[PDB]
Every structure is written in C-alpha cells, then in structure tokens.
Amino acid sequence: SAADIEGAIEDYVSSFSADTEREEIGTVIDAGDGIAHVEGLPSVMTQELLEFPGGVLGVALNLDEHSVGAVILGEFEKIEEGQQVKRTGEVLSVPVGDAFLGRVVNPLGQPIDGQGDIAAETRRALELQAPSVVQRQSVSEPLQTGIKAIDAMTPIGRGQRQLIIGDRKTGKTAVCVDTILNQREAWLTGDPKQQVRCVYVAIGQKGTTIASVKRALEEGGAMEYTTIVAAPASDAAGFKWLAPYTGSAIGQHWMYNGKHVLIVFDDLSKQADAYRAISLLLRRPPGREAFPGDVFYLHSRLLERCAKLSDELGGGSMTGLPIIETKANDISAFIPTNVISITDGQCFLESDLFNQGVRPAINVGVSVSRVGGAAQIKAMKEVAGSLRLDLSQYRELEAFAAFASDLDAASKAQLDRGARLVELLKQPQYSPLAVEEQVVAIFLGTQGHLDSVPVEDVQRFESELLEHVKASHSDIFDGIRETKKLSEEAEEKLVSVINEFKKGFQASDGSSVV
Amino acid sequence: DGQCFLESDLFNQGVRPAINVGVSVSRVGGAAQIKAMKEVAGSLRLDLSQ
Amino acid sequence: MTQELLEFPGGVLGVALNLDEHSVGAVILGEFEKIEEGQQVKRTGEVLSV
Amino acid sequence: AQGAQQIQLMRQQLIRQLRTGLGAEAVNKAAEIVRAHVADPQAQSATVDRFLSELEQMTSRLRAASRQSLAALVEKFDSVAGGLDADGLTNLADELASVAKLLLSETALNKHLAEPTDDSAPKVRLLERLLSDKVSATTLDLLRTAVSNRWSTESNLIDAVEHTARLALLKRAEIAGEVDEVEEQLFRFGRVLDAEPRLSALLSDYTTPAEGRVALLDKALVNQTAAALLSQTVGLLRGERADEAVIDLAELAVSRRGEVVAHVSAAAELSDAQRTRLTEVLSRIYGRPVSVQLHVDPELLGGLSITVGDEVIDGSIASRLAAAQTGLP
Amino acid sequence: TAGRVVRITGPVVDVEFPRGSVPELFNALHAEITFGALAKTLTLEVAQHLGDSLVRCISMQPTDGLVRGVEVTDTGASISVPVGDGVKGHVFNALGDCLDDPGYGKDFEHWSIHRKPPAFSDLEPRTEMLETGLKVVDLLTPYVRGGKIALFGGAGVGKTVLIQEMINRIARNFGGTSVFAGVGERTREGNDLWVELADANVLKDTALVFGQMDEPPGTRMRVALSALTMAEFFRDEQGQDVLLFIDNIFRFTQAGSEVSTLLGRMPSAVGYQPTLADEMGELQERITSTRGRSITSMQAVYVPADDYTDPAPATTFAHLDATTELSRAVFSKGIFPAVDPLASSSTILDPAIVGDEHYRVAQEVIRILQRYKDLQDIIAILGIDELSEEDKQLVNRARRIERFLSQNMMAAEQFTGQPGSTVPLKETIEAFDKLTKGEFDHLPEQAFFLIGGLDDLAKKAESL
Amino acid sequence: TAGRVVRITGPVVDVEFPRGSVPELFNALHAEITFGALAKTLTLEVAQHLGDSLVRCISMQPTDGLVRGVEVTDTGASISVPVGDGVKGHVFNALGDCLDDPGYGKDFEHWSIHRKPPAFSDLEPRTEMLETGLKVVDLLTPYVRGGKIALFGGAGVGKTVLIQEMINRIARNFGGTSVFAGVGERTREGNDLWVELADANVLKDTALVFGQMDEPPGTRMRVALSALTMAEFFRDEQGQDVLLFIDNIFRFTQAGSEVSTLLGRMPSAVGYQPTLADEMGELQERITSTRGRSITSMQAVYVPADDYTDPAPATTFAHLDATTELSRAVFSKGIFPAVDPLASSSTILDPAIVGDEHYRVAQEVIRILQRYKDLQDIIAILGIDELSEEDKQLVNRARRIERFLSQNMMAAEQFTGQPGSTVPLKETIEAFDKLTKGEFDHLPEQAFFLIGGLDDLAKKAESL
Amino acid sequence: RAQASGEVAQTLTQADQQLSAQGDQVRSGLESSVDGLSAKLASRILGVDV
Ligand SMILES: Nc1ncnc2c1ncn2[C@@H]1O[C@H](COP(=O)(O)OP(=O)(O)OP(=O)(O)O)[C@@H](O)[C@H]1O
Ligand SMILES: [Mg+2]
C-alpha cells in the first residue's frame, strides 16, 4: 500500500505546472440566499461555471448591463462581497462513462457515496440539443416495468416518456424502483440490445430516503447497473435544479453509444420548485403559481432528450419515467399540466385506490399511453387487449355490486370477471414479474380461468400457479420468452396445467374449484 | 388557547349562544373549572360532539 | 392635451393618456407594429374624437 | 459479496486519506521551504525575471444616449482647449464645478435641464438667463452643448459637467508639463485613502456639508493640480466611495493620456530595468502604452502579479501554493 | 453599424443599437454563439423597445452560451418562411429551416410570417359548406369553407388517420394542399407523423412545420403563423384551397402566455397574456376565404381542467365554427373514422345554410342516436329483451345508422387495399333519410360497416 | 473598525461597515439600545450582503428603541449556544441564555448554531419500531426509533396535547437524553411542559429551548437550529441516544416569510419566501440520525387554513418517515386524538418490518374506513337502509373502528377527567383484528369511545 | 441471511484491526517520504531549482 501511496503523490508532483495563463476577473457585489451578483467578467457567457475563491461554484444564469447573477451550487456561506471570482472557459459540464454504474453522484458528477473517485470516460455539457425529428425512430420495443397494471394497460416502450403522477405516499417511488429492479433479468444477459441501464435522479429527497432506495436496489442487485444522482434537500437550490440534467447527460452518453437507458426523475415537482426559487431570487418576472415563464422549457428540454435513436446513431434509447407530486389530486395545477402535455403517457396513482387495497393503485381508464400496443410483445397484446375493455365494463357495473342477483347474467359474469381482474392487477412492492410470468397472469384472467376462484383468493392462486409453472413447466415461460408469442400449443398446455393445479388448490372457504 | 366558534346556523335554529361544540374547545379544560363542574361536566363537550 | 389624438409617421393614431412631467404615455390605435423608437410624433390638436 | 466489497472499499478509503494527509504534509513542508527560499532578494529577482520573460513569450456605466452626448461634449471641449491657457483653465474648472454644485442642489432645475429633446433650445435659454451673469462666457459656450445634447438620466448631466471640469483641470496639468507628477500623486492618494478607511469614509460626506470635507482635505492632504482635483471630486462626490473615486480619477488621467493603468503586485520594488521591461511587455500584450501602479505586499511573496482591466496574469508563491494545495487527491 | 447584446435573462435578450439603426419590432436579428459544444446562429425576435436605442427581444433558440457585447445583425425583416410548391413534401422548423435536408428552401421566395388578415372588403359574406365527402362529417357536422374545426382527439382514437384522410380529401377532390402546424409537438409523435405520411405517400401533398417542445416559447408561438403563412401563399398566389392543421392551439396560447411573462407583462385572469384575444385573433382572423379560395383548418384543442370557461379554450371557441370529437367508445366498435355523432357539432347545421331536408335528416339521426345512447344502459344491465317492441324496433335502426356513419376512406386504402369512397352530399342525405325511416331494417349490421354510400351498400348487401 | 446602522425596518436592520471589515454571512452583531426599560444589547444575524459594504441583518430581539447611526460590532463568529451535559435540566432562549438562571451557560463549550448536515455516507435508513401505546399510532402510523416523526394538524386540532403525550410516553422511559424546541409555540403550554417535566423529574434529562411567538422572526427562526445544535452535540460528541421534540416547526418557515420581503426577496406562491424548500431542507437534513447514534425527532407541523396543499406542509412531508395527520373533521366528531387514519402514513408499515399480523390488520382498517368515507356522502342523503347488507355491515364496523381509534390520553386528563391508558401493541392488533372481522358488532357504538383496550372496552360495554 | 450477516460483521472487525495496524505502519514510512516529496514540490511550486 505504501508504494502506491507514495507513487501517486510522486506523479502528481511531476505533473504539476504553471497556471500563468491570463484570465478574466470579477468581484462579488451582492450575496444572499443562494445568489451572488458579480461585477466584471465582460466576456462571460450564459450558464458558464464561475469559481469563487473559497472553492465554490456558480452558473452565471443571469447577465445584466453591469452584473452577472450566479446561482451558487454549494457552501454558499463562504461567499463575501469583494471576493475575486474567476470564470472557467466552460459551460455546465459533467463527466460520464460506465464508471458511474453503481455510484451515487451529485449534480456535478462528483461522488457523494463516499467511495473512491469515479473514472471519467468523457465529459458532456448539460445542455446539448436533443435528437431531432430526423434522428429518431419509432418506439417499437418494450421497457418492461414488471408491474402488471402498467405493462398490460399503459405500456412503456424504450424511448417513451411516462409520467408517474400522483399524491404523496401513493407508490410512485415504489413503481419506479420496481421498474429499475425488473431490468436485472435483462442485465444478467450480456446482450446490449436487451441490457437496460438506469439513472435514479433524486431531487429534494432526504438523505435517508435516497439511502432506502439504494438499499432496496442493492437487495435486488440493481446497483450493478443503476446510478443515483442525488440532490438531497440539504443541498442548494442549484443542485436540485441541475440534478435532472446531470442524469440526462449520464444517460445520453450511454444512449448515443447504443445502450438502452431508463431515467427516473423523482421528483420534477421539486425541480420546478427549485428553479422557481432560483428565478425569484434573480428577480426574473413571475407568472402562474409564481413560476417563471420558462418553467415549461425547463422540463421539455429535459424530457424531450429522452428518445429512441435511429440505426444510424446506434439504435440507443433513453426512457423517461418522470414522477410528480400532485396536491390534493389536482392534476390541473401548472407543473402537472405541463408535464402531462410533455409526456407520452400518464400512470395516475390515486390515494383512494391505494387505501381500497388496489396497489400499485394505477387509476386505469384515466391513465393512458399514447404509444399503445407498439410497446408490447405480441403475446401481451393478444392477452391484454381485452383487459381494458373488461375493466371499463366493470368500472361501469361496480355500482350494481349491491344487486348482483338482479343484474342480467351476461353482465353478472362481467362483474364477477372484473372483480377478479382487479385482484389480478394487485401486486406487492419490490416483486416485479418478468413478462413471461405476467403474460400468464393476465391469461388466467382474460381467458376466464379465475372465474371459479373466489375473489379473495385470486392473488394467492396466481402466486401459486406461477410458482408451479415456473418450477415444473418452465417450457411455457421459455416459449413466451424466446419467441415473444404465446403459441397455440403452449396455450393448450398452459390450460392443461392450469387445470392440473386448480384441482389441488384450496381457498379460504375450503371449497373446490371448477 | 381555545375557541368558542359561534355558528350562525345554530344561532338561527334556536341553539343560542350557538357554540359549535365540535370545533369549539378549551385546551386548559378542567383546570379552569371548579371541582364540582369537573365532576358534572368532565366530558360534556365530547358527549355533545358525538 | 390629455386624451389628445397624436399622429405617428406611419399614419397611425394614439391617445395621450398619461401626461408625465416630461413624457406622454399613449395608447396606440391600429398597427403599433409600425411604431418604433425615434419616430416623430405630432399633434392633431383634437381631443379624442370621431 | 457486499461485505467483500465493503472491506475492499474500507481499504481503499484508508489508502486514500493516507495519500491525502501525506500530500497535505508534503505541500506544507514545500510551503515552508519556498517561504524560506523567498527571503533572498536575488531569489525574488529571479522569480520576477522568470515571470516577466514568460509574459514576454506569451463612461462605461453610462448608457448609449449619455455615451454619445459625453463623447460630443468632449469633442467640443477639444475645441475649447485648443485655444485655452493655464490661467483660463484654472477658472474654467472651478466654474464648471460651481455649476455642477448648482445642478446637484437645485434638483428641480436639473430635472428640466436634463430633459431629452432634439429641440433643446428652451433649455439653453433657461441656462442663458440663469448663468450668463454668474460665470464666464466660455463655460456657457460649453454648457450650451452639455444641455442641448441628450442624457439617459438626470444624473448623467451632472456627471458630464463634473467630467468636463475634471478634463479641464487635467488639461491645465498637461499643458503645465505635470502630466506625470499628477498621475503619481493621484495614485499615491488612491492607495493612501484605500488604506485609511476612517478619513476616506468620512470624506464621502454627501450626507454632510461638503465644505467640511473640503477643509478636511486641505488640512490632512502637493501639486496644486491633484489638490484641486481631490477637492472638486469630494465636493461633487454624490455618494461614491472616496477611494474608488480617486482611483477613477487616476484611471481617467492615464486613459486621457492614452495609456491604461496596470496594477502590479510583488514582494518588493524592482529596479528600473524590471519596470521598463514589464511596461514594454504589458504594452506588447495589450497593444497600448501602459503605466504600472505597483501595490507591493509581502503576503503575495515571490513571483509577479498583474491585473489590468478586468483581466489578470498572476504568478506568486501564494497563488501557486493555492494551485498545488487544491489539487491534492 | 450592428448592435450588441447587453443583457441576457434566459430566452430574453436586450440588444443595443446605434441611434439610427434600431430595428422595427417583430424584426428577426441574428447573433453568434461560438462556444463549440453549443455553437449556434441564435435567432432573436424584437418584442419591445426599451428606449435609448435598446430593444428587448425573445430568442427563438436556447440562449445558452451567449456573451455580452456579441454582435447582433438586423435582417431588416420579420421571421420569413420559404414559400412555394417546393415546401410540399418537406418538414420545417418555425424559422423556415428544413430538418430533413438542412439549407433546403433558402433559395425560395420568403414571406414574412407577420402580415395582416384579408381586408374587410375581400372576405366572403356567406358561409359556404365544404363537401369533403365523409358521411358523418357532411351530415352531422358540416365543415365550413374558410372556417375552423376543433378536433377533440385522443390516444388510439384515429386522429392521425382522420388527418391523413382530410389531407387526401383536399389534395384529390379539391386539388388543394395541406399544411400541418405542429405547435408544441412531441418530437416522437412528430417523427411518427413524418414517417406515417411518408408511408401513406401523402407527404408529397403536405407541408409540415414543427415547433418542437425542445424550443423556447418564441418558436412554439410563431410556428402557427409560419404554417399559416405557407397556407396564405398557397391561397393568395397559387390559387389553391388549403387545409391547415394546428396541433395544438392551446399550446400556442400557452407559449404566448409564457412569452408575456418572460417579457415582464402583468398577467390577466387565470394567468394568460393580456393580449390573449388579440393574438389569438391575429392567428384565427387570418384563416379565412378570399377571392374564391380559402384556408380551412382542423385545430386540435386542449381544454385545461376540462373547463370550457377557461380564457384559453373560451377564446379559441369564440372563433372556430365546428367541433369534431373522436371517442374510444366508438373506435372500439370498429366505426371508423370514429366521429362521435352526438358530442360533435357544427354551427352550420341550421336550415338556413344547409337545406331544410338536410337539417331534418340530421335531426332525426341525432334523435335516434340519442335514444340509443340512453337505452344502452338497459342494454347492458338488463339485456335487449327488456326493451319493448318499439324500443327494439328503434335500436335495430340505431345500430345500423351508427354503422352507416362509418366509411371506407382513403386513409384505410393503405391497409385494406380497397379504394377510399367519396359520397356526394345529396346521396348521403337521401341514404340517411331512407335509413332512418327503416327502409333497410332487413339488412344485417355487417352490411353497413365501412361502405361508401347507398349503391355500395347494395353491392355489399346483395353479395353477403 | 466597527460599523454603524443605516436603516431600520421592522425586525430587519441594515448596517454599513468599512471596506475590509464587512462581516461574513450569519455572523452575530451586537448593537446597543439605550432607552429606558428597553435598554439592552441587541443581537443581529447577517442575512445578506447588499454591496457598498452594507449588510442586512435580522434582529434576534425587538428593534424598538434602536437608533440610526448606532455602533455595531461583529462577534467574528456565528450565533453560538452552550452544549454539554450541563444544559440538561435548564431552559434556554434562542441566543443560548438561560431563562431560569441568567448567566448560567457562559462557561460551557459553545457551538455555532449553523453547521452542515452529515454526509450521505454517514446515513443509513432506520427500521426499528417505537411503541407509544396509542392505538392509532402503533397500528396505522407506527413510529420509527431514530426516525423523523411528525404530527401535522391545522389550528386547534390538538397537536400540542399529542406532542406532550408523546413526551410523557417516550421521554419518560427513554434512557437517553431529550431536547424540546419550542418554535413559535404558545408560552402557556411551554410552562405546563416545564412544570410537568419538573414534577415527573424527567427534567433532569430534558433540555428546553423556547423561542415563543412573543419573540420576533429572528429568534423564531434560529431557535430550531439552537435546539438542534444541542441535539447534534448529544448525537455526535457523546453518542448517547437522543429525542428531539419540536413544536411548532412550521413557524421556522413562517418567520422567514415575514422577513423575506424586507430582505428583498420576491414572494412566491400563496406568500412564502422563495428559499422555502432550501431553508427547510438545511434545517431538516441536520435532524437526521447517523449510523450508530440516533435522534428520534417528533416535530408538530402547523397546516395553514387546514389546506394540506399549502407549500409549507407539502414541502415538509418529504423530510419525514412517519406522519400522524390530524384533521378538524375528526376533531369535530370528538374522535380525539383526532388522527385522520387515511391521511396519516408511515414508512415502517411494511410486513417485512412490522410483521404480516400487523400489516394485514392495518390495511383492512384503512380499507374499511376508506369505504366509509366513500359511503358517507350516500348515507347523508339517501340513508343507511338503502345500502347493501355488506356495505351496511361495513359501515357499522367502521363507525366502531373510528371510535376505538380514539384513546384516553394521559395528557388529556384535563379534557376527560378520567385517567389515561396505554394499550400494548399485541393487544391493539388483536382488538382491531377482532373488530374488522365483526367480533364486536353486538356491542353498542358508544362503548368504544375513549376506552383503553379490550378489558376497558368490556367494562364500559357492561357499564352501558 | 443472519449467518452471512455475522460473517460480514466479522469481516468488518477484521478490517478495522488490519487497517489500524496498516495505517500506523504506513504512516511510519510516510513521515520519511514526506520530506522528499516536499523537497521536490518546493521546486515545482517555485518553478525553478531550489
Ligand atoms: N405496490 C405496493 N404494494 C404494497 N405497498 C406499497 C406498494 N407501493 C407502495 N407501497 C407502500 O407505500 C409506501 C411507499 O410509498 P412511496 O414511497 O412509493 O410514495 P412516494 O411517491 O415515494 O411518496 P414521496 O415521494 O412523497 O415519499 C410504503 O409504505 C409502501 O409499503
Ligand atoms: Mg418517493
């Protein structure tokens, strides 16, 4: 250990050299609440990283006739009037590379997990332009979330932008963490075409919450391929403002190299809440809900960097899963209204469904994916196309639950079916299903094998069936996986094994089945 | 330290002084009463709110 | 005069609302697109009238 | 496996903070070694020579309208000065300062006088009535242009009159052949009043009566040009810091000559050869004649530092120590 | 001679100019961004004169990397789009620069997007009806030649297919042209549209202008005027009838409000710009018929909070003359083009403009479909047998009516292979008059799906 | 050398300093007031640098009597308060001066109020449950030992009695050290707490810092940090486990909102400072617990206008692991402690931690009460007999669950006369498991109201 | 899981002891290395031989 300890310092000494190069200077005139006004710096450029002598950084977000308004990224206390401010020749830029996999980094690509320094592969500006209409491709291949309620009713294709919009403590973080955990079965196969990479941008989380998510990912092995960009609430407004662009840069580097990426913004509401602070402090003119005018351009220029690239650009993709925290379920507020119009789809989580026992609590019928069936494998299209119709018929008939005996038989059957499909879409956290398994799960429902199982047992029946089929009849899952289609022969054998199992299954009332 | 919320809809329907027993409260409570009233009225507000 | 009708070189008319100590804030009638800095503005001598 | 990676990363953190503390001790011992080396005058001479040779190898506040009007007013002052004389310039500066005081006090007059118009003739007449008997006619001829032109704010008219009086006094200094002495004394007083924050802050008396500040200057602080300039400036200071005002006086003096002032920092005063070499090198770098205001200080031991305009070229034991100390792993 | 940037606050940029060179407002100015990673020729649109030779401008592209004092050159004219027959088949940004082939179109004649609407004396004094030939459109919601049609679409309800259909309609029946103003377009669905229209081979008859969400609100605002200026060239000079699609107009209002806030103007009511109605009119009052040729428009219109009283949708609905609404509840039946006959409406369906027979037939169709839309509750909860003989005698006609509103249309020609039918107006009226009176009860429902008129109804029924 | 006051406006003061002597941000400045009974040394905290060597400061003490031009001396350091074992058993103000015994703390080690929160490397997620003995808390919103607990609630809904009861339950048996921050809290309840802790002798292990609402915004802001720095000393420098109570944390932000407009910050939404989230995070992140040394935070959060959408509560929600959530609706029904069981939440309530036996019952209770709130609108107008037999049975169970969640708290003796009760966790789970499955539908609805457990439930049912 | 957790805790304690001993031993030599590193850095910081 001593040898390398001494050798590193020896090489550092050897590589040291003069900083004689002339540079421009400014001086702080005002400082307060995270903003510093710097006079001078005539050649400064917008978004340029300024450096203050205590080792502090600024963004130079506002230029006036005689002053530069710089948001301070950290340790604001150390700034004072009269401090010599130097300008770097560089716009906001962050390192990128595969070394970030498994690391927690601040919005400047510096490690905050307390592990070693990250081996930077390249550096990218935080504000490069998005892939244009001509560079992109149709979103034709799925981003399996492992959530039955999503992959079957509001599917996500890699290259899509799907909003997890909901109240607090309604399962948003849970859903996106399950999305990240599900990708391991793809990662373990070293095929970059299957292999998804992930970036969990934590904006305004408390440190222990980011640590809980990190522990939930480690418990699932996701840290082999997941990065966290952490702007904890402890850190300045600027860090909360730049965390999503740092994550987007880390993901864009992988995307343009031809990898597939999954970006979770948690939460963009606090991204907007931080840009509002920065803007109001800079005395920019306010608008609705006190946000600045460009608060849409804030999020669009972020989410629109998610794309699926053409074959000419390696075919990569970056899949955005932005989360937003609505207040009293007002999806009509400003920032929700913006992101609902920027994103391709919306997985509306609602607290009532959450308390009614419907978890992951996606309010189907209101949730949508404008991409549609293109984000599904043929087997899932075939099996789940009827699911939305059946659940809408149930959403109508549910008012007649009190009168199930008077209801007409043809729709009595639909009510009994809908209740079991609802139970079928229930799913516990951190237990994402592979597509091969949830194809069969939805097949149990839409093809009517659950119709004789008592409602209260559905969740267990499925959980037992998939455990039997997974262990004893793997050829079914192998077929669905390797051919992406539920062939007729595998359907018939699946029905045969479903009835094989259903004779042994026992329900709460001890009754038999079929 | 407490509220005597006089509802107009109680005042009109004959309940005068019109204290809305449910929202009204005195957080010092029994310490602001003589022992006799603490005996006889120890839980009157909760009984009337229920 | 206040509420005087001022003519701007593009044939445009405006109403002199806010007579400041040294300036005259006017509401432009018609194509304000044709109005710009440095343009000579002159009096019609007529209060806002048709 | 989590435990295995955990122990490996604990080892890595151990060696990392080992390297960090070792580098810190190394840079601190190097700091002590170089701070001992810097004691010799020959070593300082070598450092300044190395930096100078390396370098050898290598109105604004005002807006557009006021900017143009001030340029034109100076263009007419050029014509006035072409016929002026020292004795006349002495009175010109004082009368311009007097009218500056008038406009600074009778604000109601000033707001009308600064009115932006092309047909400024009435304003001129307002001046002609008010001043024609109070001050000499040449001052009126120049204030005619000062008033006729356009100003972005009522403050810039006073600013332009003060600037014109300052230019007239500086022109008296230049014709008398004191161009160098006046600049030297202006920088002397600049550094003095920047180092004496009690009397200098007391000089920014625009809340107090000005004649007190004038008499304070006369008592405390010399070529009559610099004294007149300082007294005029403190009389027309208008809330600006006295030190930053006198340094702006010196900047304007050297820029009127055509040069620009480059502030220099070093451990000790170098010989004339170093001064001339540095001036020629800076002129080569920035393409202008230059003057060096050497603000020597021991804290910035070693090397040589220069700042001109809003740019720096800095070499010193302290700055390079900061560079070495911040690079540790 | 040229100006200098002196202040930058996001998309807003202040440019100082010499005394005599100040540009008139709504002029386009060019500026440099030289930092390599972000190098650009930044475009600025003059919004205000701040006084003292200083102009407040709103940037068309991200200002990141701008420098104070950088040179700004006045072009002497507003944002100007290339116009001609050459813009058909290509996709443009709001500034008139081609995406598919950079530098294309720069040789064409350029028209300033800021131009006044037709003079009062040039307008048409009466509302002519657009014989597009779609049964449901022609009967229930007759479009207006020179009017505007709200298009309440959705996910997977055939909006893009109806767009392709109307493009083919105008391009083949009227010999016209189409311009697609994508205001605030999602880049993904914009590329989807590009490749779908290229596959349908209708792109050759369409000019697309995409103000992408990537961009500051300046271009998301001005792109509607860009496309409308291409349409105004096709109307005024080449004498064609045009169909201007706008998706989405509410995002034009939104971008206008964002620009208003950026420039520092006090917000109005709910938070829109004070000039809301003035610029919405500047856009809408310009889509009209002149000298026998017209620009019709289909405007996809968001409605925030589903509140039809919010200033933005209220101001939008003050102009547009018809409302087509697509429903999943109808698409899922196989009833293409899926226009909901009951939610949809038109201001021309009055016996003064359309003939009295047309009005009567449409009102009877609406009555029957209203009865059926009320009875579907019984149909689902109690079954058809719960209905009386007269209610079943009605439902039997209603099913076939709603089927007959479907049409084999030129957009389906891409997939079914069968050619798209154009149904004359008189034949549509004389078909639904007989169908409502029950003259075709004996035919099965399958006979009415996706059939182009009454003679085609017979051709299908007699062979089935 | 020293400075001088230039401008005074409310509690905010502006102070000019020589060029090089300007104090750093958050330094403590001292200035004398020399009038009569108001004569005092005045502490100001440097909030901003305004340029021209001016600095804007917030007065920790009322500015009445302050004079322009008076001398101001910088401490050279921030506000510092005593830390050590000796501060236990004593009462302090935000400035660190003892209210009980003036001059007591002036020989202690003094720690700056301001310090950075621990690094993300020092943080681990806590999962140990804290048993309080309150049915609603232990079942539906269980607390975390070492976590950040909170008691949200509008005005008057009982936050103070609940927080004092949690003190009586935790700090009594807790073996470590306790700190109580009174932030903008009533002085009367602070004295009731002081004398109650003195009577229970818990005071020997409790350090109290009071910045009551009679105090100006500066001290209402910095009192939370002054208590938190004592908590952080007990955490970091001694390792002895800590409890940190805070009533009311909202006031910390509120005080800032009072000074923001004087500090020249433009106001945001409904009227908070723009720094809201930054200040609240800089405070809350410090309250966290590093590995191997715990702080069990218990902070009551005021909810303006009962609107849980107000930016302050909405931002506070993020920093908490368990959120008991009081509401005026539950309070009006006499269901004191008035916890809304559906709003309240906890991160620990997972079967992996609390056990399936607990999770099942909690989720069943939440499901029943959610269905009850969904059905109340029907019940109020249509009636109970109009429901299904199953919905009606669920309603009769929900009405009883509501009232069994109520509990006779010890601190609520003065509210109820009767003594308080502690219900073990096992008995809570058993009781609510019986309730949800109907094993008590035969008891009168009133028997569950304000009763501590199953034995007391039986005794009260047999008393009716 | 509990058995492996015990193994991990044992690994952590072994790390603590091993790294304490290694830190002392390596700092013993680092004290010497520091003199030469500082001597060379004195030349690099000065930009000339010292
Ligand atoms: N699919 C699920 N099944 C069962 N429980 C769930 C599920 N999803 C979430 N939960 C429960 O909800 C809580 C977590 O909610 P979550 O953290 O997703 O909310 P959130 O959107 O992150 O809110 P915030 O971001 O404000 O913390 C936990 O108690 C967890 O057990
Ligand atoms: Mg979350």
Side-chain angles (χ1 to χ4, degrees), chain E residues 168-191 193-195 197-198 200-277 279-355 358-362 364-373 375-376:
Chain E
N168 272 288
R169 296 267 159 186
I170 268 59
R172 302 170 69 162
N173 300 345
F174 292 82
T177 286
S178 179
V179 184
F180 193 102
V183 181
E185 272 286 59
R186 306 180 177 79
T187 312
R188 182 193 58 75
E189 82 186 305
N191 161 78
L193 184 70
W194 184 48
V195 301
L197 300 192
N201 205 6
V202 311
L203 176 59
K204 75 195 190 309
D205 297 309
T206 308
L208 295 109
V209 199
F210 291 148
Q212 285 148 223
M213 287 193 170
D214 302 319
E215 302 184 48
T219 56
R220 310 201 317 277
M221 180 172 55
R222 296 307 187 219
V223 69
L225 286 85
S226 185
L228 176 56
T229 305
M230 298 181 183
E232 280 210 300
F233 178 90
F234 283 126
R235 187 194 66 207
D236 284 358
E237 286 281 315
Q238 294 293 94
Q240 289 187 291
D241 285 293
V242 189
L243 181 76
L244 174 75
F245 296 98
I246 299 183
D247 190 352
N248 193 310
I249 190 69
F250 171 81
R251 298 194 292 238
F252 168 78
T253 290
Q254 187 200 296
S257 79
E258 293 173 30
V259 171
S260 184
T261 49
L262 286 173
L263 291 169
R265 308 194 298 232
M266 288 201 61
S268 179
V270 184
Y272 304 101
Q273 57 273 53
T275 52
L276 173 61
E279 67 196 46
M280 179 59 71
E282 177 176 34
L283 176 66
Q284 299 280 18
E285 181 47 43
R286 185 168 167 200
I287 296 160
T288 192
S289 47
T290 69
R291 309 177 185 227
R293 296 293 170 198
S294 74
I295 299 171
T296 305
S297 68
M298 296 202 78
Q299 305 186 352
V301 52
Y302 184 67
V303 48
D306 217 338
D307 180 3
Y308 302 77
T309 77
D310 183 297
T315 307
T316 310
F317 302 144
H319 285 282
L320 53 81
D321 311 274
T323 290
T324 289
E325 180 157 351
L326 313 188
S327 285
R328 192 73 78 85
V330 176
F331 191 91
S332 86
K333 299 177 182 186
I335 309 283
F336 313 140
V339 178
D340 190 320
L342 299 177
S344 81
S345 63
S346 158
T347 65
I348 298 309
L349 185 52
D350 292 339
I353 312 95
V354 296
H358 189 155
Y359 180 61
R360 181 184 57 71
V361 174
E364 200 68 12
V365 170
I366 285 167
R367 186 192 71 77
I368 290 164
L369 294 177
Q370 270 302 154
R371 281 301 312 286
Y372 184 27
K373 190 67 226 78
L375 268 47
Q376 282 162 18

Side-chain angles (χ1 to χ4, degrees), chain A residues 167-174 200 205 209 213 266-267 270 323:
Chain A
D167 295 26
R168 60 167 294 244
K169 289 290 160 202
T170 187
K172 305 181 302 301
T173 301
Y200 176 78
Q205 305 289 52
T209 292
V213 169
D266 182 357
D267 307 305
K270 288 177 282 180
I323 310 183

Side-chain angles (χ1 to χ4, degrees), chain G residues 1 5 15 19 29 39 41-42 46:
Chain G
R1 188 191 292 116
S5 176
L19 305 173
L41 183 55
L46 192 272

Side-chain angles (χ1 to χ4, degrees), chain A residues 40-41 45-46 63-65 90 128 133 136 285 293 296-297 300 304 341 343-344 370 397 400 407 411, chain E residues 6-8 10 35 37 62 64-68 186-189 191 213-214 220 254 258 261-262 380-381:
Chain A
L41 300 175
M45 70 180 66
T46 316
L63 316 185
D64 283 327
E65 301 162 68
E90 305 305 328
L128 297 183
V133 165
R136 295 187 188 226
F296 182 98
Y297 171 46
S300 42
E304 294 286 291
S341 74
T343 53
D344 300 316
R370 292 174 71 77
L397 292 170
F400 296 85
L407 193 43
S411 287
Chain E
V6 302
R7 168 179 295 100
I8 299 122
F35 181 63
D64 311 328
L66 261 173
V67 177
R68 293 178 292 171
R186 306 180 177 79
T187 312
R188 182 193 58 75
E189 82 186 305
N191 161 78
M213 287 193 170
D214 302 319
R220 310 201 317 277
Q254 187 200 296
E258 293 173 30
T261 49
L262 286 173
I381 295 294

